[PDB]
A paper describes a structure:
The non-structural protein 1 (NS1) is secreted from the infected cell and is thought to be associated with disease severity besides its proven usefulness for differential diagnoses. NS1 can be found intracellularly, where it is essential for virus replication, docked on lipid rafts of the cell surface membrane, and abundantly secreted into the bloodstream of infected individuals during the febrile phase. NS1 is comprised of three distinct domains, an N-terminal hydrophobic β-roll dimerization domain (residues 1–29) formed by the intertwining of two protomers, an α/β-wing domain (residues 38–151) that extends out from the central β-ladder domain (residues 181–352) giving the dimer a distinct crossed shape. Here, we present high-resolution cryoEM structures of ZIKV recombinant secreted NS1 (rsNS1) and its complexes with three human monoclonal antibodies (AA12, EB9, GB5), as well as evidence for ZIKV infection-derived secreted NS1 (isNS1) binding to High Density Lipoprotein (HDL).
The cryoEM maps of ZIKV rsNS1 in complex with human monoclonal antibodies (AA12, EB9, and GB5) were obtained at 3.1 Å, 2.8 Å, and 3.8 Å resolution, respectively. ZIKV rsNS1 was incubated with Fab AA12, EB9, or GB5. In addition, anti-Fab nanobody (AfNb), which binds to and increases the rigidity of the elbow linker between the variable and constant domains of the Fab LC, was added to aid in structure determination. Both the heavy and light chains of Fabs AA12, EB9, and GB5 bind similarly to the surface of the ZIKV rsNS1 wing and β-ladder connector subdomain region with an observable weak density for AfNb. The binding epitopes of Fab AA12, EB9, and GB5 were mapped to the wing (residues R99-R103, E146) and connector subdomains (residues D174–L177), which are generally poorly conserved sites. Fabs AA12 and EB9 datasets showed distinct classes of up to the theoretical maximum of four Fab molecules bound to the NS1 tetramer. ZIKV rsNS1 remained tetrameric in all three cases, as seen in the 2D and 3D class averages, but the map density of one dimer was much weaker. Subtracting the poorly resolved dimer region made a bigger improvement that led to the final reported maps for AA12 and EB9 structures. AA12 and EB9 were then shown to have in vivo and Fcγ-dependent protection against lethal challenges of ZIKV MR766 and PRVABC59 strains in Stat2−/− mice. We found that unlike other antibodies such as 1G5.312, 2B713, 5E324 and 56.228, the antibodies AA12, EB9, and GB510 do not interfere with the membrane interaction of NS1.
Numbering used by the authors:
A (entry chain D), B (entry chain B): 1 to 224
C (entry chain A), D (entry chain C): 1 to 215
E (entry chain G), F (entry chain H): 1 to 120
G (entry chain E), H (entry chain F): 1 to 352
Write the structure that this text describes.
Amino acid sequence: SEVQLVESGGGLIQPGGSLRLSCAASGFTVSSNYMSWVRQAPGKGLEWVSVIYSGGSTYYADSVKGRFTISRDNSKNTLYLQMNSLRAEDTAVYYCARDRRGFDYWGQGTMVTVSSASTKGPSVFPLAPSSKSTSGGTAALGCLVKDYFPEPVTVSWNSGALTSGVHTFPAVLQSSGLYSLSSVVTVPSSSLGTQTYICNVNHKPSNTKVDKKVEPKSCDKTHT
Amino acid sequence: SEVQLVESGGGLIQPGGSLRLSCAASGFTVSSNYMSWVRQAPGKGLEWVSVIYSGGSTYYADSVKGRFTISRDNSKNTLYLQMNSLRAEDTAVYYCARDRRGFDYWGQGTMVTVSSASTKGPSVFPLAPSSKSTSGGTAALGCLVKDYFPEPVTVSWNSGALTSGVHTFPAVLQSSGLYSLSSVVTVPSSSLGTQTYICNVNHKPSNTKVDKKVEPKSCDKTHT
Amino acid sequence: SDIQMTQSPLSLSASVGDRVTITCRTSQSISSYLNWYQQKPGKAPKLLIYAASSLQSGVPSRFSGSGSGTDFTLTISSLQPEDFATYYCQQTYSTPLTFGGGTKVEIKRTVAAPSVFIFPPSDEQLKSGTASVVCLLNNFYPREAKVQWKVDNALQSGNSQESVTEQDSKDSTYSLSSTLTLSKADYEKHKVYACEVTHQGLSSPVTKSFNRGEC
Amino acid sequence: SDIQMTQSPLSLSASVGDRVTITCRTSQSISSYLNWYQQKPGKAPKLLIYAASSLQSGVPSRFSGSGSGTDFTLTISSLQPEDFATYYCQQTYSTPLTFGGGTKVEIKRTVAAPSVFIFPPSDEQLKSGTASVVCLLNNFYPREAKVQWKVDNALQSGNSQESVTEQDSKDSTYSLSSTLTLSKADYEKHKVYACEVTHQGLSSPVTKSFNRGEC
Amino acid sequence: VQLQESGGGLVQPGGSLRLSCAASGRTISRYAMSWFRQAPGKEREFVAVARRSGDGAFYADSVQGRFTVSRDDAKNTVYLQMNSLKPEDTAVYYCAIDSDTFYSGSYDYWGQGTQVTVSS
Amino acid sequence: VQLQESGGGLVQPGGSLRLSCAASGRTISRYAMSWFRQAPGKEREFVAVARRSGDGAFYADSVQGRFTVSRDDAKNTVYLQMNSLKPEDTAVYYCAIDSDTFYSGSYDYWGQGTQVTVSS
Amino acid sequence: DVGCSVDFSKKETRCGTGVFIYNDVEAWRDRYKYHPDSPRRLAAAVKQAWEEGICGISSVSRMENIMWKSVEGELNAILEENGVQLTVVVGSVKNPMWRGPQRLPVPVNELPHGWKAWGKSYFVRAAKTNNSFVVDGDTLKECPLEHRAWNSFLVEDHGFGVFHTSVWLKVREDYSLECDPAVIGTAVKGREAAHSDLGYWIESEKNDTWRLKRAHLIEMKTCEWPKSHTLWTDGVEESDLIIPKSLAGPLSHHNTREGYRTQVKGPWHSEELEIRFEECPGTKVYVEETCGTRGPSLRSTTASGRVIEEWCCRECTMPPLSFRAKDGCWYGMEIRPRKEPESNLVRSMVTA
Amino acid sequence: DVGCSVDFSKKETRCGTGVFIYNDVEAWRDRYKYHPDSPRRLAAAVKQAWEEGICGISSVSRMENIMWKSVEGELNAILEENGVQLTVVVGSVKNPMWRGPQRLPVPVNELPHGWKAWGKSYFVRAAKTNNSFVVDGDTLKECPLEHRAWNSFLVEDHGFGVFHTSVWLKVREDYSLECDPAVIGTAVKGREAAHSDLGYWIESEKNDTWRLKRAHLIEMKTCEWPKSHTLWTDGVEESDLIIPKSLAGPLSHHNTREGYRTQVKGPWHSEELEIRFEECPGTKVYVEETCGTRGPSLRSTTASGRVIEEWCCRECTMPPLSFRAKDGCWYGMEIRPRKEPESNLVRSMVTA
Ligand SMILES: *[C@@H]1O[C@H](CO)[C@@H](O)[C@H](O)[C@H]1NC(C)=O
């Protein structure tokens, strides 16, 4: 078969837990080559973890000394990494690479998440179009989705009938262990009176589906 | 010349930092006898950390393996322990001890604190006496201190003029990384209306001194 | 796997002049490496009896112990005033050098019941969007008791912390304090707060409550 | 000691048909063990140039590199639409096999100013005891910009989080949204909330504001 | 699970008596048991509790130095010894079994109780 | 600190002209520089900006393909070459300096308006 | 340093300089004799130790025991001539040699008088007295384990002009759990290595990656193998050392094998043992996923003489790991019988 | 396996059995008959290497260079039978032998022609062509470093000493950074041990926790010493290996010295070097707190014959590390000149 590396064994683990990653290999034997583990955090560069020579010697990156351990099974031609005492800062995508005269082969990767937060439907608060955002016959409106877990969240407007001039911002992770998101859209001012604009939210890992129709703030002074 | 193990190198360190501990010795030579470091967590028992034989070998606990390293300066009979990648759970009191038959010698200890906070004056709230804590002519009035750092305050009453009946609960740590305690004193009812009572809180590192006067309530109409 | 220790009993009651049996079990035969340490709060542990039958130099001659196999034992001939502390054992056969859990030796007295109160969160604190609710138990014995929180007859859980003092030096009772913290947005959702108590000294539960907004 | 692998420039702008130059630098002579990888958003890296002068089989002939000692270089003769990615350099001389700091090449595109907006917190969020603010900048170029939050003309700091959009596919412009979160007890103290904007394509800053509870 | 108590009677001051408590359907070796009394028209009050082996039992202030309690797992029975009685002891007595952990102080089952009287 | 612009004058349509910005206090070798113009009866508008050597320069939408910037770190001076001028471009021109980095982009100092007119 | 080195591999005569292993295990007493320090100070030590109730030292190594049952007589004579009342005794050792807690002391001075070494000293006989300082022996009921001694002697020099070794020794003043370094040697040359002790001879080879080849064990110590005399002490954990770390095994990749873990319940009581990676006669070790889990070592010969011809296991690199003993062939923990119950077969003594 | 020895401190002599390690450096070895596969296959490899941009070689070890030099003529004569116009040109070697990013390939086919490569009876000559295939020398300009090869031969057998002294080689089939195993041997006896190969000889002593005693160096390799052939690997960090890991130093606790760190700026350009811990002639290595900081090794002998006596340092522990070379005395990085300038002297060209 073609030369490839295929990892497996990712998931969600509480802090202090443990996990073991497997990177199979094909087309060549791990025993006569130099193999490594490489990881990249979401939104950052590449980093090298460990290496196991063909003579059996192994070296590890400082940040993972003690906690990690690299080994191989010569019968099934497999490359193992042992992950003990998982931290929160150990979130990344992990690759295995082969060195011959340069890391000329790579694997697709596998995602490892370390979070103690408890799973959850989102909170949706509409953003009201106002004269502040109205200028030259065009106005902007949106919705706000907050405090959900886990990913992924999907946002659409008017059941997908609206597909232009609409932006969905990247998801952020809050200090509370939950994600946040925002969505905005621009529309001509005259369409506000007849065109009913709503924002649909879906969060499948909690079986939650929400919808919200957006209006300008109503100021009928019924206070007394 | 006598046997006395003496540690040093304690303090406060933020997560991810590094620190080096040094257990000097006297009266005997380190290289001729084994050595170890021992730690006790807050409100918990004893646990073993490492050992360095006389011939050179060394062993480490399975939890701090890798992040830690033990060594000795054979030229000055010193016993070093070096820590990197510290965490919050690494708080404890650490000891260095010998091993001949049993752990027949222990040192004195030093405290290691790991927290990302800064020096925060205490918040003082009075517990005014009421019918809710009075029984048989004696009533309890106290003060509440909250959200401070570093180690707890030294509470007092009437600047030492009052000497009997004072209580001070042990401090506790909140999930915000700050301390808490309660103070209470019991006095005869007749002294409520004729004797002034003041609770003093002092927080030496922050140069913060507060005098709070505790008095019975007043539901009288004095809003304006 | 490694070799494990298991002390017992975790806490024992016995008046001065008594005799107490203490066991320190290990998981597999370790010959006769057994050690006994005495630590008093705020001090480094010290060693009394090693080698499972030998006595350290300078130790008073009232301690002793023995055992064979995986089961060992220690005893004090006649408890004196100086023995109010906790004791750990250990092995020194093969690394790791496991220690023992611990034991507490308690002074002896008779059964007493507490006094149950409750406090309201001062309105001044609500100007900062926080509300602390406190329940109190006073001067009871022995150490072991139970308290819980109920609001509108609903059972609270996982949002409170306790604080228990040590033994009183004169009457030898214990005081327990519990705090329940709620934000101003949650504090005004409910009407009545209550605290519950049950202990060996009472034949039925004791309950108290205070309603919101009473000065 | 390890070997540092600085890269430059962090990002560069060049259109189709241009000739681009990138530089990777190392802290000591690594012989001629230098590698160049091309990673596109959300994909694994792949190898272009090894040995500092050699060409991996299959790579198109517009790629070339050179240099000796601590200074190497890479060049593309005629940049093309499909080469919008990031470039990492690496050395496989001695462990640890360190990587480079990355550089992003803007294959496309002239100068525009942003459109500024603001939103007030909806009341039903105040039923939970907290409020959030939003400020939006739409369709500006180049990527550099700045946004600050001011309340009653007082400067906030360290309590707002901002998110950016990827270069717009059809028009090649960015968008930035900054969200500020405060507790209700703090949200009700103030009177004026505003957003401040700054850009190289603007002569003077821009401002938007709203009054608390304004309807 | 059901319980029964027997051993009451009338005795002169300074006499002696031995009360017993028994249960069916539960093995008490794992649990402790509680002893209670009740004066005429008053609420039931605590007397004593018998713990597992090693921990013995704890006695109320009034009975300490006078009464004694003992347990027999093999016969599913618990006994109480009364000495140096005085007219004040007159009250109905009850026995109950606690939960397996003494922290709760909660009782799973209760006995019927019987009268005990002392007169001069 | 003071800046000084030079190169003002008059030119017929279709001509060309060159101007210079000189500064003091800060060294130009590390900092980018920008110009601005204001036509009669209208508000100031961005014209062009030049970054450090190799960092390039960016031109507005209107002046694209007509103007071009240059700088001299050694002589502490910056020039613009204007070609294909037309009467519309008449406006007072200014020269201002930026901060340490383009990610900051806050203008520190500004020059003195110099007259430029195109007519015939 | 110069040596013959008739290279049997290439049939090549050689000469030069270097370092040479010697397999001094098999030719045990054709080469080695052992005598202690001046028995007067040893007598003083045993006197100053009896005050603390020492029963008497159990030997760690056959050398120590064979010195014990050689120097008794003049030790007794030196004790008697000084007026001391004590009788030293010695018996027959039993494998394994367990770890006794106590330690011998070291006298600060010798007795002022006593020279009974002179004349016909070894052969003076006297009646038995009330005090027994029992060394080894079947006195396990007479004296509980906790009062014995262990590992109280060091080696300093050996080699003498008597055509046999005269290993000098003396009492230890230092606590230690480590095996003796003076009589241990190891080396590697190309594709061969050897870990060697006076009772242990362990051979390792490079097939694919280093591994264990053969071991010859005449005694079963219980001291710890030092690290400085070990090859490749890195990246290895105790769960795989075939020879348990507690029974004086070395911590190395050369001391491992694929498909096997530490052998804690091996026949560590036998008189003589050799570890050979070959099947026991009349047997064949299968590998199957359905076999049972680990258990005590089972001899291949029934008490009546019958042998079993089927064994299985799950994780072993087939076929054998066997111990060769004087009374039969012992298999490994991971290999267990396929049809016969473990009840009928002779089972290893409790050595957990 | 069989042989003898003779000790020096004691005169006891004995034959026996075991494992034998020999020193093979001081005599610079004898003259041997190398057999690199079939020199015809090596020639085909030299062609296919030129076809793909390989234009030279830098020797990894002096044995490799000497084999090249001794087979140069037949290499040139072996290709002329077919359509190949290469011309090997072998020069002298320089120290250290910097590495090469390329690797000689492994041909799958061979040039079909006569077998006359080995031992042609004189009369071998060839005609010089335009383009060379250089090997070492001053041919840097003709073939830049990045197009050179390095470390592509693997020993297979080196016996036949009685009648042929034939050493056989091959072209290795896989990438690697570590030295050749087959020529490495190490041994330990009690208080001493040694690591060595064809050009490396390293000695260690048990003073306290073991240390480094002496080492003799005739070449400056730049491979990495395998870990299976070293003593007490774990617990050590590469910042304290006296012979840098890049110059094929081993990772060991025997490979170090208290007070000194890795020596990466040493005189690794001399032809022959002896590592010895002792003060050089006329030198007085003080210990001072005001002394300087690490720096490139400075020779004790000036190009004019002048020498500098007084040197100081802070972190050193006596005796001091020094390299003895045919040029003169070279000191270590830690010990800097006490008062004399660090630049008005024969400074080691930076060997970082
Ligand atoms: C020995 O080594 C070879 C190659 O190193 C390997 O394929 C083989 O399986 C090993 N074992 C045997 C018994 O040949």
